Write a protein that binds this DNA or RNA. Structure first.
Length: 53
DNA sequence: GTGATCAC
DNA sequence: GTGATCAC
């Protein structure tokens, strides 16, 4: 089932509400792996500090 | 330079 | 084998 959506900036520079595929703690910083739906390309982006890991 | 992850 | 993600 999907992860909680999160507002990210895409590598194109638009804000999108996207569902990460995978999330983890990068040391203290929470990181998600996202796919830009329009372009199909993967990118990583910081998650909120309270985001469920 | 570290810490984890995986599409490339 | 590693770029790229952040705050420290």
């Amino acid at each position: 089932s999907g992860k909680k959506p999160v507002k990210v900036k895409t590598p194109a520079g638009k804000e999108a509400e996207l569902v990460p595929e995978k999330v983890w703690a990068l040391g203290r910083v929470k990181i998600g792996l996202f796919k830009d739906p329009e372009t199909g390309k993967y990118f990583r982006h910081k998650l909120p500090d309270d985001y469920p890991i």
